Structures are given as C-alpha cells and as structure tokens.
Design an enzyme around this catalytic site. Sequence first.
Site, PDB file in Angstrom:
ATOM      1  N   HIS A 125      -6.342   6.226   3.410  1.00  0.00           N
ATOM      2  CA  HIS A 125      -7.614   6.054   2.717  1.00  0.00           C
ATOM      3  C   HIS A 125      -7.865   4.604   2.340  1.00  0.00           C
ATOM      4  O   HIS A 125      -8.976   4.273   1.911  1.00  0.00           O
ATOM      5  CB  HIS A 125      -7.686   6.941   1.465  1.00  0.00           C
ATOM      6  CG  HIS A 125      -6.878   6.442   0.303  1.00  0.00           C
ATOM      7  ND1 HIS A 125      -5.702   7.040  -0.097  1.00  0.00           N
ATOM      8  CD2 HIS A 125      -7.091   5.421  -0.561  1.00  0.00           C
ATOM      9  CE1 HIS A 125      -5.220   6.404  -1.149  1.00  0.00           C
ATOM     10  NE2 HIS A 125      -6.041   5.414  -1.449  1.00  0.00           N
ATOM     11  N   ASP A 174      -2.025  11.087   4.452  1.00  0.00           N
ATOM     12  CA  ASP A 174      -2.594   9.844   3.940  1.00  0.00           C
ATOM     13  C   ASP A 174      -1.542   8.751   4.116  1.00  0.00           C
ATOM     14  O   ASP A 174      -0.777   8.425   3.211  1.00  0.00           O
ATOM     15  CB  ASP A 174      -2.962  10.060   2.471  1.00  0.00           C
ATOM     16  CG  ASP A 174      -3.980   9.070   1.937  1.00  0.00           C
ATOM     17  OD1 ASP A 174      -4.591   8.328   2.738  1.00  0.00           O
ATOM     18  OD2 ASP A 174      -4.176   9.053   0.699  1.00  0.00           O
ATOM     19  N   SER A 195      -3.515   1.974  -5.661  1.00  0.00           N
ATOM     20  CA  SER A 195      -3.630   2.883  -4.528  1.00  0.00           C
ATOM     21  C   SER A 195      -2.712   2.412  -3.408  1.00  0.00           C
ATOM     22  O   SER A 195      -2.713   1.228  -3.055  1.00  0.00           O
ATOM     23  CB  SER A 195      -5.072   2.950  -4.022  1.00  0.00           C
ATOM     24  OG  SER A 195      -5.770   4.045  -4.579  1.00  0.00           O
ATOM     25  N   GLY A 196      -1.932   3.339  -2.853  1.00  0.00           N
ATOM     26  CA  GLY A 196      -0.957   2.988  -1.844  1.00  0.00           C
ATOM     27  C   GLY A 196       0.323   2.375  -2.366  1.00  0.00           C
ATOM     28  O   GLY A 196       1.205   2.053  -1.559  1.00  0.00           O
TER      29      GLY A 196
END
Length: 203
Positions: free
Chosen positions: A36, A70, A156-157
């Site tokens: 994403h 993801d 994120s990530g």
Amino acid sequence: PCARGSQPWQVSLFNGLSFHCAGVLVDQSWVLTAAHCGNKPLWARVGDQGEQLRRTTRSVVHPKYTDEHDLMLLKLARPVVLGPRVRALQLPYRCAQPGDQCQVAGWGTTANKGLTCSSITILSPKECEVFYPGVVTNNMICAGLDRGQDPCQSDSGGPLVCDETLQGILSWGVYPCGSAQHPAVYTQICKYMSWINKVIRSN
C-alpha cells in the site's frame, strides 16, 4: 527510547520531498515495505544532508496483492555501504509465536526528530478477531502495544522486530490514535520468505 545506533536497518521512504512510508533493509540493495506504500516513485533514506540517500529502481509488489498480501520490495539504485550505522536486518528463519516480546521503532508520523522504541506482544490471530470481526488471519500478526502507548507513534511499513529478526511489516490497524487497546495488524514475514528471497535473487 531507541538507543543510538540501534535500528541500522530503518528506512524512511519519501515520495517527492514528502514522507510517505517506512521500510526495512533486507539486503544491501533491497528495502521491504507494504504494498500500500507504493504509488511510485519513491526514494530511500536509510540508516540511523543525511546518512545515505538512494533512489529506488525496481518496485516488486507481492503478486497476490482490505490489504491481503501487503508487501513490496524496493531495489535501491545503488547498494548501501554496509556498516554499524547501516546494515540489513536478518530475515526470519522461523515464525514468531503468540506471546513473544517484540519491538517497533517509529518516528511519530501520523501527527530533534527521533526514533522511539516500544515493546509489543504477539496476540493470537483470534484475539485479532474480536477487534476486527471478519479479518482473515491469513499470514499476519496482531501486535499488542503496552497500555498507555499511542499506536500512532509508528509509521506505515515500519518493521516489527522479534528476537533480532524481522517478523512483520505494519499493514493496518494503527488508527485511531490515543489508545493502545486496539492491536495493529502486521504482515507475517516468515510466510513470504520464498518470494522475498527469490526477488532478491538470493533465491
């Protein structure tokens, strides 16, 4: 939190000039993050001006990529120079069990600039079902933050590291801010090792 020199594998990914996502360094040329995260283009600033700034060339999203698988591998335009400041993080040879004590280091994106580390507990991928009924527990990790911790410190990530190895990439479950009761949802990395190793063409 986050002792200096710790997290040599920590990668912050930028789109344009703006912070987009966080990542892990799994190889001198390879950064792993969540699928994403890629709009493209990104570029990596790696290690803990700047330490080392690399542009990304190949973006390999997981072929079976509300986020099911993801994961995405970003190849750096040039290898980083390996050292105490900057090194890859060891990939999992085993899967982390529910109850293990792990860590996540964030910069506080989502609302001097430091890394803060927090302890995290692997819940069972059933306990995950009580907060998100209808989540398919799949290859994932629900990671419980200790109470009083603001989940939105994370990025994120960003990596979830258990026992010096990389067990997860933050997928979703960060919001809402201001409460640790709800667990974050990480991709289970020990389940993807065939794809990861072979994209690195370490095979």
